[PDB]
Amino acid sequence: EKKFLLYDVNFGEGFNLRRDVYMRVANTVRSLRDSGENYILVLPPWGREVALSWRLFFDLESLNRFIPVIEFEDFLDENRPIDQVIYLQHYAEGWGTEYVRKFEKRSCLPPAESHYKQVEEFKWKGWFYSYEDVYSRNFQCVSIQGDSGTLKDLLKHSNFSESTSIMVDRAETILHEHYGEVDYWKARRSMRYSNDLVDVADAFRKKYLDSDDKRDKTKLVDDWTKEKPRRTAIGGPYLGIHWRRRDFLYAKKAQLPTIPGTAKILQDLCKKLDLQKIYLATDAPDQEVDELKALLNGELEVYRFTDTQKLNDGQIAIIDQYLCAHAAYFIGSYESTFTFRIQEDREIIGFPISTTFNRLCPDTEPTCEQPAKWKIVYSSDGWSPWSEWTSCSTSCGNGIQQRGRSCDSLNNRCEGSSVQTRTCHIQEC
Ligand SMILES: Nc1nc2c(ncn2[C@@H]2O[C@H](COP(=O)(O)OP(=O)(O)O)[C@@H](O)[C@H]2O)c(=O)[nH]1
Ligand SMILES: *[C@@H]1O[C@H](CO)[C@@H](O)[C@H](O)[C@H]1NC(C)=O
DSSP states (O other), X not given: OEEEEXXXXXXXXXXXXXXXXHHHHHHHXXXXXXXXXXXXXXXXXXXXXXXXXXXXXXXXXXXXXXXXXXXXXXXXXXXXXXXXXXXXXXXXXXXXXXXXXXEEEOOOOTTHHHXXXXXXXXXXXXXXXXXXXXXXXXXEOEEEEOBHHHHHHHHHSGGGTTOSEEEESSGGGSBOSSTTSHHHHHHHHTOOBOHHHHHHHHHXXXXXXXXXXXXXXXXXXXXXXXXXXXXXXXXXEEEEEEEOOGGGGGTOGGGSOOHHHHHHHHHHHHHHHTOOEEEEEEOSOHHHHXXXXXXXXXXXXXXXXXXXXXXXXXXXXHHHHHHHHTEEEEEBOTTOHHHHHHHHHHHHHTOOGGGTSOBOOOTTXXXXXXXXXXXXXXXXXXXXXXXXXXXXXXXXXXXXXXXXXXXOTTTSOOOSOSEEEEEEEOSOO
């Protein structure tokens, strides 16, 4: 008995926050399947006016090794109705002294009812990834606190037993179960980039960066399930920088360097590491990149992927990430999920952690907070130290971060909390 899980996320969320939510939902599907449910994940079209296949960005065969996945267009070809939408929203009273995992159907909080409308008894209209003719047979809001496992529980609740296809909107509401542990990393590891994108990126490395997998020692097994831990990747003879600006300048100024600050940082790293080539991934306008270059030493060369051909903006972004990921040394931007996904690529490729978890400091704070070191994992008073805080659950609006610790109750009292939670807010949506 096939069942289908569809999802969407807050309209304002970017590509790389959406990549993280995929992992949350993919782990819900994993749990569902481990418990005997034949669930298939339907991949949501990439949109903000467009409705683009996952193939353009990712290797489906890789994704399919973790859980069964289909494109949304394939799902439509089966002529199956969407039986139920579950919207997903917070508990209006907010979380308490413990972060209780729970869910409950509740009246819809905004903007739910401005985004879905009952036009016939079994016809609820909504965005549905820009597809005008798609609709749901049923609709409701559910307040939820919890994780991939909690979502599993919700989807198995008797209230939805008659549905075969269910769409969970505002999926960013859900947290990772076991953040940074095996299954989190299996989901991350399965998101191999599309071969065509990897080919284009490798052509650039060869032609401009004196870089290929052979010399860089960055060759990865074709089948991600066979990856093993290593810290022996060298990378091409270049420095990678993700330079996040645009909106970050107008919601995030105090923790970013200026143009001269950035120049200084790059010059210093290049001297320390004997590198003369820099790969720059940035969203900044040409002028700003031009002013950066003009502040650098004449010996240093700055490269960017700009011969983009017929490639769409998301493909270009992936290419920038892959190129940063293969540098001898990487430095990224504060709280950017585009940067977070690069750090994860480096973990997978097998670089030393020193070369990966680095962030550009603001001009007046050279000992600024550096990113949390969530390292790749392949295997599964007496309190441990607290873990790092997780990345914010949301890239815009209010979200959640947590940190955890453990204690052996058999040989110690182990009093007090093993989890802390706090609100985070990266920028406005
Ligand atoms: N090509 C390219 N695009 C970028 C870069 N940095 C930001 N962007 C664009 O801006 C978006 C920012 O949203 P997201 O990926 O969620 O990352 P975040 O806002 O940095 O957390 C990215 O998806 C890209 O479309 C970059 O270095 N290269
Ligand atoms: C299931 O549906 C009924 C309304 O028909 C509702 O009372 C109940 O709260 C729902 N259960 C959950 C756990 O959301």
